[PDB]
Amino acid sequence: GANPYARGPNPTAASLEASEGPFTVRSFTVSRPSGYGAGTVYYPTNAGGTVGAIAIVPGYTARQSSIKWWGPRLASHGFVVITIDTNSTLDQPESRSSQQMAALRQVASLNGTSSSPIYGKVDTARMGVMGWSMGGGGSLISAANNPSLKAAAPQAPWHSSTNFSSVTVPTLIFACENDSIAPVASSALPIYDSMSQNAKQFLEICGGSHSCANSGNSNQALIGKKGVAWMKRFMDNDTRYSTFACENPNSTAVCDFRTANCS
Numbered sequence: 001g002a003n004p005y006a007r008g009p010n011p012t013a014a015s016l017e018a019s020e021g022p023f024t025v026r027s028f029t030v031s032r033p034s035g036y037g038a039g040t041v042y043y044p045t046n047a048g049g050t051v052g053a054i055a056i057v058p059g060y061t062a063r064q065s066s067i068k069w070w071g072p073r074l075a076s077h078g079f080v081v082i083t084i085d086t087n088s089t090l091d092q093p094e095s096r097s098s099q100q101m102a103a104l105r106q107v108a109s110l111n112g113t114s115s116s117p118i119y120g121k122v123d124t125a126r127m128g129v130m131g132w133s134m135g136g137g138g139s140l141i142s143a144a145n146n147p148s149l150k151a152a153a154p155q156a157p158w159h160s161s162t163n164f165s166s167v168t169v170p171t172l173i174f175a176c177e178n179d180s181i182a183p184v185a186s187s188a189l190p191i192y193d194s195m196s197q198n199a200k201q202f203l204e205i206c207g208g209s210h211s212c213a214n215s216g217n218s219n220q221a222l223i224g225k226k227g228v229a230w231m232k233r234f235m236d237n238d239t240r241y242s243t244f245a246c247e248n249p250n251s252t253a254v255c256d257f258r259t260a261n262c263s
Contacts, residue, residue: 005126005236007047007078016228016244017221021076023047028117030082034109035102037085040064041110042071043118044078052126052150052235053080055103057096059133059156061089067132069215073224074231080122082107093159096138100129101146126150128235130227132214133158133182136173140191143169151234153227155213158182162190170199170234174223176208177255184256192258199234199263201226201246204256219253 008022009015015022023044030039044051054074058066064083071081082103086096104127111122128151129139136154143152144166152167155174158181164171175188182188184204192202203226205212205219213223229244246262248254 003237003239004049005052005123006238006240007049007051007236010240011229011232011244013225013244016225019220020072021078021228023076023078025072025075026117027071030106033084034106036099037087038064039082039084039103039106040068040071041107041118042075042081042083043121044075047078047121050121050123051078051080052128052231053082053104053107053122053124054128054130054231054235055100055107056081056083057086057100057131057135057138058084059131059135062132063089066211066214067130067135069220070130070227073220074228077228077232079231079235080107080118091134093134093137093141096131096135097141097145100131100135100138100142126235128152128231130154132156133210140164140167140171143167143171151231153230156182156188156210157191158187159191162187162194164191164194165196167195168197170230171195172201172203172226172230174213174226175202175204175256176210176212177204177206178208179210179212181210189256199261200259201230201262202256202258203249203254206253206255222249222251222253225249
């Protein structure tokens with residue numbers, strides 16, 4: 001019958017490109033981070049049902065600031081989002097993946113903690129992973145190791161290996177055309193091309209530096225639309241979002257677009 005995971009009003013381009021989704025968002029600092037450095041949890045106060053959870057990790061040297069904009073953007077569409085600082089700013093992808101999963105674990109913990117703002121707000125069976133650069137590579141490692149994850153949407157990813165052929169999780173890769181740190185041709189695009197078993201998408205931002213999908217980027221309408229659409233489609237099984245998730249967007253800002261096995 002009806003999709004039990006559908007939340008919020010029917011989407012439009014305008015509603016997805018807006019700064020804010022339909023739900024009101026609040027946030028808190030994690031009191032006692034369990035297996036990672038620090039965290040902020042963003043959550044909808046008025047979603048109308050339990051929602052999935054997404055953990056987001058920065059890149060090398062970076063902190064929550066780099067990725068913070070996703071917290072309100074996703075949460076306002078009906079997700080609990082945790083942004084983390086790693087135990088060390090110099091942690092590598094494998095460690096970042098462990099920490100990202102520890103953050104998802106702690107969101108599950110807090111969903112069961114009566115004092116927490118997110119008590120009973122999370123569907124702990126529906127989780128997703130995002131992150132920047134090494135944190136993007138960490139997201140792909142998370143997905144490879146935990147195939148029950150429902151979606152992955154890393155940005156400007158890097159890992160020491162580009163072979164993510166084992167990933168069966170729906171994966172959207174944001175890439176940055178002019179990336180000097182993790183060049184698209186040797187990092188993001190090979191990673192994309194390695195994935196053969198999944199729904200997948202590649203979206204490269206014209207003229208973008210390595211930080212082109214970070215807080216303060218000038219393409220929040222497009223990037224935020226795609227990130228929310230992908231997560232809605234795959235974490236919520238919400239086919240209202242199938243066209244937004246799968247389409248080549250009509251944007252001046254897109255300089256490479258690829259997708260496979262999308263529905």
